[PDB]
Design a protein around this nucleic acid. Structure first.
Lengths: 55, 177, 324, 158, 305
RNA sequence: GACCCUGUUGAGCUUGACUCUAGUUUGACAUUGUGAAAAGACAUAGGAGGUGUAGAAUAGGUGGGAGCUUCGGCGCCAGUGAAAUACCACUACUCCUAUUGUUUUUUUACUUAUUCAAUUGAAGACAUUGUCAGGUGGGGAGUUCCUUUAGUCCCUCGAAAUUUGAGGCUAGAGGAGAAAAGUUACCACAGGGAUAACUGGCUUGUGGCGGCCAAGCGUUCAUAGCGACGUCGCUUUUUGGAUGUCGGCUCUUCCUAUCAUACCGAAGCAGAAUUCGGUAAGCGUUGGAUUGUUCACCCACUAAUAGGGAACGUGGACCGUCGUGAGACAGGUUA
């Protein structure tokens, strides 16, 4: 957003957004492997019996 | 290390005297009997004691770098300019002084002209354009400049109005590093 | 074993194989490990108070008033002020721009107090590249006498002239001369000062190129150049004066070819030099013998400074007296 | 092998920074944006809209290059640099800007454009030069358009 | 200082009043002899802590920031003349009202700045009379505790590292009695499920705490890093030193075997026991475990003084 | 407007010739001595040493040498070291002492020098003086080789436990004269030149750089070469605040890029509550805290309180005067 504030053409603003949306895209695509883990531990946590130690 | 000629001598003391009150202490014989002499090297002039000037004659002329205290520079058109190197002697016996507040002290160090909202206290007998030397509370020499407007006219401007001009400020020592 | 120690040290610290071997030799093993921590570690930041425009207490009060966290450092210095934290940048303070204080290191302090500069005395500095030493010497003569600043590079001279004329020195002339040629130019000084070009092993925090870019060839030419640098110091000073004048030898290296060997070569070639107690408050004595070679026992009076003992850069100080 | 060489550099940076971090006074001097706003109170302005590299954070400029103002957000101190031998890209700091062929004026402020040669620290690579010496600064040509995409990309000229 | 989890903080306060201070129940028949203050963070935590202790049965008065003018006088009157045993202040109600000589101080939430802790313990153990000061430390509140070490300059012990730690001079951290904590957190969950009004106060103070977590002044990086090591260190979960050497033995004979259950590393996650099964094999391969010499006179230190 | 140029002014940048010399300066040598007191250096004659590391160790060094041998201590050996101890054989530095002396300084005086008053008194061996050997010389008088690179690794001076550094020599390339000159994608001022002005099948959801792979086409063929999708390295990793003029409200109408309400497809979707997607604009579509103002976040209500369009809907401008290291004007008239 600092880069865009000093931009000077519609081409420059177009290329700067595509960089930002592209850079956030390749960060999530690298995060693929832990997202599958957290999806699978979510399914098994919700499918876990309720044990209350106090009673 | 050519000493100044007749023509060059009146130029340096003229703009000196537009900032100085007692021209006789600068060229005065001191206790050791040796005086302060003016030489010039590479179109800039130096203010030096005579003895250290005399043993400075051993170095080759286009080989020596600097000597004592630089009063300023000879310009190509023959005028004279002051540098902040001249400030320690210039603030020693100044004739009109301006005090600025701490929020206006750093503007001078960054290089702004003095505006009305920063002055701490003024001196009188200042014409519409008079040279003056600026300090903070502690009388620390910060620079020198010319008054923008007269004793009456400088204040009747806005509190956003420039009251004294910037000529040279101590921040230029932060450049050649 | 020793060979496993050398390969492990060169791998983990990134030193060259040669210079690690030389530095491992001059220390006991556990003392070498504590030394390798410190010299890579950055050093504390130290401030020299201009005695001309201000003094220790009122400058200290002024900088705390600007938010700078200070502490008077040691009983060694009445002039030194350590810094710990600063909201404002140190060069930004209007006290700096007037020249109330100057950035230095600790090792820049001690050659000047090794010298004992007096009023109306002709003095010298063969290498004054940052200009801190020259401004310290002029603080002691109280704006009298004459200092001949010298540096063989014009690029460093601009920072010299900027630092000198900010500090209000008014008594120094700066020349771009090779200092081997300097006694032919003038000679006849009281108190000469030399901070020779050195290998730079004493300070690796400022210059980390000496980790590897220093080899067998560099350890022959560089101490060779200190010799012609140092013999010029005796051949330029006065055998007698109304106020007795002394040489000071200061190197920023911990090497043994650069330090304690050059002073042996000088005191052998010129017998009109003696060495006495150097006046610095602390230190470690020099080694009288390192690798099968004997130096004269005057080097027990020389002081060596180490990163591990003191948070200072690696240093050598020795002062000379001229006889004839 | 490209991962292995990148890991050796990244691991070497990790242990130095973690085990040997020591408290030191280090603060950033104020920007030139507020410096010019103070000066203007004390379209006449001229502001550079190209990506720059400066070096030392708080300095005064020469009076020739003093109307120009370079904003904080357009500054980069690190570039992505490719080495054609060993086929590795790493982040190394920019030391100085050598020549911008578009404009000799842009060379002085250090404007980073395409085909602009910069000096980069090649300490982390540890490439051995002649006479058994480790390099510290090389040429690197900028091969991207850093005004259009935020990253600065370069190739070592080795 | 006692290591408690976030879900057991209410029962931990009930331990300190019941078995550590041995406070009496009901109204007491010039303060009282027990006279324990309770410090907390937000007015919503005041309302929970006050109203829980009414249901507990202790005599408690409460003052907070935007409390009424008349309402503040009557409760600080009741504490001063000894008609109540517990005073619950945040910090701003503390610094306004006048505090008498006080015996015990409970820190329900750890102060962010180490100097706030000084101000709290300055309200007690004055004028030569002995005093006590207990605090419920947490995992997220741990780096503020290691910053408290650096300010007071005291030694920190972890559970039973020393046989006889010095309470007045050394910082002593540890865990509470296991058995009696699970009884009085059972009571808290029983009351929470029973009465709606306390349950509504929990939900308000849960989101009030979540704002206070976000805007609290963060701890230093060196204190943050050194908190990770003491969590790993074996003294974090051991029994506290007050409870005696006799309590340390049967705790030792059990947890020497129990700690091997906690230190277990599963060689196979249940999804390995498909594409997901290949994914679980993909993580474990990627993230598997990776294989005085200074004089006392002059040594420029990086620390002041 | 940007942008180009011209003149003045600053910031520079490169120059501004050679030989003696005024001036000025460093060192050396003399007038410049006579005592005392000290101190130092060397001249000889004696006495005693020595702990960087490691090695058990207060290892000068060096020639050899493996019991020379009184006890078999010490040896041999083994370590440990750059160097190793037994044994005899040599000679270095330092610190003291002495006299078996040459001296050099400092201090203290005196005048036996030297300088002033005088034309006999004071200073006083200080200055001062002169001669050699130098440094500089924008000044005065005349006059019209260095730079870049390599080699002889040859000669000279240095340095190093044997190899270096600095000079010499040789060879590839360059050359009206202290009054002032050439240059800048530079600054301030004054002026000249150039586009009447922007978009109108524009815009949106998926980054850049280098490498590997690669169907085809091509200068004659997948190799003169152009080259997508993927994958690898950098950003990027093993312990959970941002926003300038604007609004604010009502009302009309439209789009859908749908927040709610209707319908379906999928998900360990048990129920409940949801999540993602698709058809859908029929019908509805908030505040509060904070703020210069908004968004983000947080809190409350509600079925939800979506986003947009309506040629972005309907109710100064110079000029003159004085300044010039900067600045202005109860200065003007006019747009």
């Amino acid at each position: 957003v600092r880069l865009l504030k000093y931009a000077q053409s519609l081409y420059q603003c177009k290329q700067l957004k595509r960089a930002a949306l592209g850079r956030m895209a390749t960060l999530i695509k690298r995060l693929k492997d832990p997202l599958i883990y957290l999806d699978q531990v979510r399914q098994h946590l919700a499918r876990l019996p309720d044990i209350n130690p106090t009673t | 290390m050519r000493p100044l000629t007749d023509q060059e001598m009146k130029i340096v003391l003229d703009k000196l005297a537009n900032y100085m009150t007692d021209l006789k202490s600068l060229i005065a014989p001191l206790e050791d009997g040796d005086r302060y002499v003016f030489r010039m090297q590479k179109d800039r002039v130096y203010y030096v004691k005579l003895s250290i000037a005399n043993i400075a004659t051993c170095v080759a002329r286009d080989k020596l770098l600097s000597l004592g205290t630089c009063l300023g520079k000879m310009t190509k058109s023959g005028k004279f300019r002051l540098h902040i190197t001249a400030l320690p002697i210039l603030a020693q016996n100044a004739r009109y002084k301006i005090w600025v507040k701490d929020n206006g002290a750093q503007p001078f160090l960054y290089g702004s002209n003095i505006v009305k909202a920063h002055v701490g206290r003024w001196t009188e007998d200042c014409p519409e354009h008079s040279g003056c030397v600026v300090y903070n509370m502690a009388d620390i020499p910060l620079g020198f400049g010319v008054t923008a407007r007269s004793t009456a006219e400088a204040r009747r401007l806005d509190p956003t109005g420039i009251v004294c001009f910037r000529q040279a400020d101590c921040g230029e020592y932060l450049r050649d590093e | 074993y020793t060979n496993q120690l050398l390969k492990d040290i060169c791998a983990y610290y990134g030193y060259n194989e040669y210079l690690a071997e030389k530095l491992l030799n001059l220390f006991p093993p556990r003392e070498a490990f504590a030394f390798f921590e410190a010299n890579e570690t950055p050093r504390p930041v130290v401030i020299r108070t201009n005695t001309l425009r201000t003094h220790r207490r009122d400058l200290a009060q002024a900088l705390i008033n600007r938010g700078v966290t200070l502490e008077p450092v040691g009983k060694w210095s009445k002039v030194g002020l350590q810094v710990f934290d600063s909201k404002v940048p140190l060069g930004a303070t209007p006290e700096y721009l007037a020249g109330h204080y100057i950035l230095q290191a600790a090792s820049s302090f001690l050659p000047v107090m090794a010298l004992c500069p007096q009023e109306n005395e002709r003095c010298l500095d063969m290498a004054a590249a940052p200009g801190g030493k020259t401004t310290h010497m002029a603080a002691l003569m109280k704006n009298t006498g004459v200092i001949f600043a010298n540096d063989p590079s014009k690029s460093r001279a601009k920072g010299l002239i900027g630092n000198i004329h900010r500090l209000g020195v008014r008594n120094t002339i700066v020349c771009n001369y090779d200092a081997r040629e300097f006694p032919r130019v003038i000679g006849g000084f009281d108190r000469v000062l030399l901070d020779a070009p050195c290998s730079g092993t004493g300070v690796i925090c400022k210059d980390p190129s000496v980790k590897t870019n220093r080899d067998a060839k560099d350890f022959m030419q560089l101490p060779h150049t200190q010799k012609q640098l140092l013999l010029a110091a005796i051949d330029s000073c006065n055998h007698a004066s109304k106020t007795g004048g002394y040489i000071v030898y200061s190197t920023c290296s911990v090497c043994v070819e650069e330090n304690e060997e050059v002073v042996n070569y000088a005191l052998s070639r010129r017998p009109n030099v003696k060495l006495v107690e150097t006046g610095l408050p602390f230190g470690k004595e020099g080694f009288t013998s390192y690798m099968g070679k004997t130096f004269h026992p005057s080097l027990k009076l020389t002081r060596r400074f180490y990163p591990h003992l003191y948070n200072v850069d690696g240093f050598f100080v020795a002062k000379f007296k001229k006889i004839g | 092998t490209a991962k292995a060489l990148s890991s050796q550099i990244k691991n070497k940076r990790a242990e130095k920074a973690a085990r040997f971090s020591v408290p030191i006074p280090k603060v950033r001097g104020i920007s030139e944006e507020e410096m010019f706003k103070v000066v203007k109170t004390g379209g006449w302005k001229r502001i550079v809209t190209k990506p720059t590299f400066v070096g030392p954070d708080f300095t005064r400029r020469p009076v020739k290059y003093e109307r120009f103002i370079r904003p904080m957000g357009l500054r980069y101190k690190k570039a992505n640099v490719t080495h054609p031998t060993l086929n590795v890209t790493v982040q190394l700091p920019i030391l100085s800007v050598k020549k911008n062929p578009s404009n000799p004026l842009y060379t002085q402020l250090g404007v980073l454009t395409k085909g602009t040669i910069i000096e980069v620290n090649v300490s982390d690579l540890g490439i051995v030069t002649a006479s058994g010496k480790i390099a510290w600064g090389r040429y690197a040509q900028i091969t991207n358009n850093p005004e259009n995409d935020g990253c600065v990309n370069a190739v070592l000229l080795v | 200082f006692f290591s408690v989890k976030s879900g057991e903080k209410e029962g931990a306060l009930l331990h300190i009043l019941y078995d550590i201070i041995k406070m009496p129940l009901g109204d007491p028949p010039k303060p009282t002899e027990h006279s324990t203050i309770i410090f907390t963070a937000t007015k919503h935590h005041v309302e929970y802590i006050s109203n829980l202790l009414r249901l507990a049965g202790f005599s408690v008065s409460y003052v907070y920031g935007s409390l009424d003018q008349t309402a503040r006088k009557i409760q600080v009157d009741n504490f001063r003349r000894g008609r109540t045993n517990i005073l619950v202040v945040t910090d701003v109600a503390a610094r306004g009202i006048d505090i008498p000589v006080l015996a015990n101080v409970i820190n329900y939430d750890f102060p962010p700045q180490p100097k706030i802790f000084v101000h709290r313990v300055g309200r007690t153990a004055r004028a030569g009379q002995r005093g006590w000061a207990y605090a419920l430390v947490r995992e997220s509140d741990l780096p503020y505790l290691l910053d408290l070490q650096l300010f007071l300059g005291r030694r920190l012990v972890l559970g039973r590292e020393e046989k006889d730690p010095s309470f007045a001079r050394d910082i002593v951290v540890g865990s509470l009695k296991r058995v009696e904590l699970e009884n009085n957190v059972e009571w808290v969950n029983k009351v929470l499920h029973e009465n709606e009004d306390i349950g509504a106060l929990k939900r308000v103070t849960a989101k009030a705490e979540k704002l206070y977590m976000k805007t609290r002044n963060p701890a230093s990086s060196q204190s943050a890093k050194r908190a990770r090591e003491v969590i790993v260190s074996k003294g974090w979960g051991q029994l506290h030193a007050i409870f005696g050497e006799e309590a340390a033995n049967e705790e030792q004979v059990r947890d020497n075997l129990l700690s091997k259950i906690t230190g277990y590393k599963p060689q196979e996650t249940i999804f390995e026991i498909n594409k997901a099964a290949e994914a679980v094999r993909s993580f474990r391969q990627r993230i598997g475990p990776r294989k005085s010499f200074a004089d006392p006179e002059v040594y420029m230190s990086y620390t002041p003084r």
